[PDB]
């Protein structure tokens, strides 16, 4: 049963908490910040993804209007410096395989509407990937599990492609820090 706006669901490798954010049944109290720093809007995805690689990473991704936009992003900004670092794009199929920590981005379509999503991959395995995110799942996390979704993967042809749970949607790919 999916749990109140703002509940603890579990946590992100890294102890990177995850929230519900069911909405439904301007204001700056639903703005989330980590010391002065802007993280995002109370409890979407990119809010968990920013604030993921900022506790974990010590870096951020400039503030989208739309998770998709993120796939078009060439830089991460290393908060304690403002030094910006390199960041690449690996479309879906790719043979460029995705690791720990990486952004994983969604086109704007099906589930994800008109904004897209974005997630963070948490595990590799031979024939899926684990997730973190944020409003996609809003109800508590089993007892030790540090991911909210498992997509299968398949590795063929020296190219990754990974599936989505929902039949309707459009991954656009993963993003990885480098030149």
């Not at 519900?20 to 700056?28: F, G, I, L």
């Not at 109290?29 to 109370?42: A, L, T």
């Not at 993921?52 to 078009?72: C, H, K, P, Q, R």
Request: aromatic share 12%; glycine share 8%; hydrophobic share 40%.
């Amino acid at each position: 049963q999916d749990a109140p706006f703002g509940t603890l669901l579990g946590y992100a490798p890294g102890g990177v908490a995850i929230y519900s954010s069911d909405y439904s049944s301007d204001d700056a109290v639903f703005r989330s910040y980590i010391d002065d720093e802007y993280m995002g809007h109370k409890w979407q995805c990119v809010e968990f993804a920013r604030r993921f690689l900022f506790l974990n990473y010590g870096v951020v991704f400039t503030d989208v209007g739309m998770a998709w936009e993120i796939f078009s992003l060439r830089f991460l900004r290393e908060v304690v410096n403002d030094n910006i670092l390199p960041l690449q794009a690996f479309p879906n199929g790719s043979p460029r395989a995705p690791v720990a920590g990486a952004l994983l981005i969604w086109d704007k379509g099906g589930e994800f509407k008109d904004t897209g999503h974005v997630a963070i991959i948490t595990q590799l395995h031979g024939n899926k990937v684990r997730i973190a995110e944020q409003n996609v799942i809003h109800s508590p996390l089993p007892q030790g599990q540090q991911w909210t979704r498992e997509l299968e993967m398949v590795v063929e042809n020296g190219c990754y492609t990974l599936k989505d749970t929902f039949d309707d949607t459009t991954i656009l790919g993963w993003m990885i820090q480098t030149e």
